[PDB]
């Protein structure tokens, strides 16, 4: 009668969450539905040489390329590759870290077969590195807080302040500072940058905002793998805090 | 300090090696798709003189803006905003706390993004408490089953993993293959991508807007994710 109580709390949290997300997104979806219907009607009015069926075929052809991983915006020939050494390193890192953006996913049958075996053997391999970093860093943090405890209201209270301090430092070095960097590089708003860092470091990875390629502009080949190194050190910093607490 | 660094090197090598394999598997398809879409855009402008090349890009961007928000720009829908209703927002809420994040439907408003940060920060550890609670109660049942076998150990452990791959991996994939209309590989690919909380979003259960789904189907899939995530957690911990 303890796990069932937790299950009820979780179901209630999903129903409550569903009610809040519905009220926040229903007016925007209705406005976007009305907007796109008007933009299609006005395009045909402004371009008399385009038939209504020819417009739909163009849209579906652009969506066919977009779903495959190729953005139909701008000159595709001039655009960089989503599967070059740098981008495929970030795709590999995206699989083993269970973030799964889903923006540049495998389309070929061979790519799907290798992706199953890559996640099955790569996710536990990454977990061994993530735990190894967290246990080595938890030892350093354990030694630093034991030195603070030796100097000193409550022995439990002095450990909570240290925990808050570790979270605050991590939220500046791995959350605040990187979000400022993404805001300038990608051209996202301040809200979108924090939203991206939270969605990424929590391994949710929606894919609505992706560190690299979120524009038809040419991104450097060294920028995208460096973002994975931020993901590695960010995921690992919070793992050492939870290992120290436990 | 010469053990974690060795693991780090193995992981980096695994990413470089993985990147080389994925590049060889997907580079010919990406090149073909890039050539295809560039030709379709050039032919549209050749057939429609009255359309400027910039006016074409603006139309594409506008269609993609609606598509990413959840509204398909193909044809016309209605007040059927079934992407953010009580049923779909319940699955989106599940998509967040389980860290799967399909991202087929995501928050667009600023308020929706603010609530999503606080929903994941307080919901992911809440789901983790249920996932650990199920796994510890499940591990006790496993322990009692393996102690009964020992009274009559690696083979038994392998048998308990093979049972999970049939009940939670093989059987569900067969059901999705017929219902959704996916190929045998796509079904296994979906189950692996889902149970490993990767959630790309390329294949979503109950996502094909053209299928008249029965009411008992979509909530049954989320029950499978819940009971499968605990059994799959024991496999990844053993590995």
């Amino acid at each position: 009668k303890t796990v069932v109580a937790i299950f009820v709390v979780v179901v209630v949290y999903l129903v409550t969450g569903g009610l809040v997300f519905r009220a926040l997104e229903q007016p925007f979806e209705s406005s976007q539905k009305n907007t796109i219907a008007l933009e299609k009607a006005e395009f045909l009015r402004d371009h008399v040489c385009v038939s209504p069926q020819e417009l739909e075929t163009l849209i579906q052809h652009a969506l066919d390329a977009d779903n495959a991983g190729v953005s139909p915006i701008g000159q595709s020939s001039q655009q960089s590759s989503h599967w070059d050494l740098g981008s495929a390193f970030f795709f590999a890192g995206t699989v083993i870290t269970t973030i799964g953006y889903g923006n540049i996913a495998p389309s070929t049958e061979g790519g799907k077969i290798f992706c199953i075996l890559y996640a099955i053997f790569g996710i536990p391999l990454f977990g061994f590195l993530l735990a190894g970093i967290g246990d080595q860093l938890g030892t350093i943090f354990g030694k630093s807080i034991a030195r603070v405890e030796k100097v000193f209201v409550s022995q439990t209270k002095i450990r909570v302040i240290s925990t808050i301090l570790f979270i605050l430092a991590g939220c500046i070095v791995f959350v605040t500072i990187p979000a400022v960097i993404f805001k300038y590089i990608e051209g996202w708003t301040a809200l979108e940058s924090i939203y991206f860092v939270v969605v990424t470091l929590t391994t949710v990875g929606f894919g609505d905002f992706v560190a690299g390629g979120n524009a038809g502009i040419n991104y450097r080949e060294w920028y995208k793998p460096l973002v994975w190194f931020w993901i590695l050190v960010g995921l690992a910093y919070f793992a050492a805090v939870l290992s120290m607490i436990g | 300090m010469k053990t974690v660094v060795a693991i780090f090197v193995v992981v980096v090598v695994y990413l470089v090696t993985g990147g080389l394999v994925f590049r060889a598997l997907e580079q010919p398809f990406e090149s073909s798709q890039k050539n295809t879409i560039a030709l379709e855009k050039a032919e549209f402008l050749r057939d429609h003189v009255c359309v400027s090349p910039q006016e074409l890009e603006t139309l594409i961007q506008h269609a993609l803006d609606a598509d990413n928000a959840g509204v398909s720009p193909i044809g016309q829908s209605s007040q059927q905003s079934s992407h953010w209703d009580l049923g779909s927002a319940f699955f989106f809420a599940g998509t967040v706390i389980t860290t799967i994040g399909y991202g087929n439907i995501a928050p667009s408003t600023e308020g929706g993004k603010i609530f999503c940060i606080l929903y994941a920060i307080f919901g992911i550890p809440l789901f983790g408490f249920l996932l650990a609670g199920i796994g510890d109660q499940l591990g006790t049942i496993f322990g009692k089953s393996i102690a009964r076998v020992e009274k009559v150990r690696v083979i038994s452990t392998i048998l308990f993993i093979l049972a999970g791959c049939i009940v939670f991996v093989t059987i569900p994939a067969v059901i999705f293959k017929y219902i959704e209309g996916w190929t045998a590989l796509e079904s296994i690919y979906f189950v692996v991508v889902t149970l490993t909380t990767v959630g790309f979003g390329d294949f979503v259960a109950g996502g094909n807007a053209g299928i008249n789904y029965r009411e008992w189907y979509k909530p049954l899939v989320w029950f499978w994710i819940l009971v499968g995530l605990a059994y799959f957690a024991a496999v990844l911990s053993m590995i």
């Epitope: 051209g187 524009a215 502009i217 | 961007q61």
Partner: nanobody, 121 residues
Framework: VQLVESGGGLVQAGDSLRVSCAGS????????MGWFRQAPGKEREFVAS???????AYADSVRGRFTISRDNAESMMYLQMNSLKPEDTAVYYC??????????????????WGQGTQVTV
């Protein structure tokens, strides 16, 4: 650092007029700019917006009539206003955002602003 508007005139109802906004002292291609307006006795209202390339976004009151555009080679932005109504007579200010990914619509996100140009219908 500086935004300059030009094209404010007096026009008849149901007629077309185009106003221009030129950027100076900053990298034009890295800033997503847009238009805003303010009629006498009313608060500031959104008009049009564009990203670094060709993604536009308009207010529900001016879609299908107004057209925002940019020519990065000439470091300029244009707003072609068609079939101008007597409800469009306002001071039009052009503003720019360091966040270029999508066409921003909230005035809070726009950093640099213009002096305004009076279009009277």
């Amino acid at each position: 650092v500086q935004l300059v508007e030009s094209g404010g005139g007096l026009v008849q109802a149901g007629d077309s007029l185009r106003v221009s906004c030129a950027g100076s002292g900053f990298t034009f291609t890295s800033y997503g700019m847009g238009w805003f307006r303010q009629a006498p006795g009313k608060e500031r209202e959104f008009v049009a917006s564009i990203n670094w390339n060709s993604n536009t976004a308009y207010a529900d009151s001016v879609r299908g009539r107004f057209t925002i555009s940019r020519d990065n080679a000439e470091s300029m932005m244009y707003l072609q206003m068609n079939s101008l109504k007597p409800e469009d007579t306002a001071v039009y200010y052009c503003a720019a955002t360091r966040a270029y990914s999508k066409p921003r619509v909230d005035s809070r996100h726009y950093d640099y602003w213009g002096q305004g140009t009076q279009v009277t219908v």
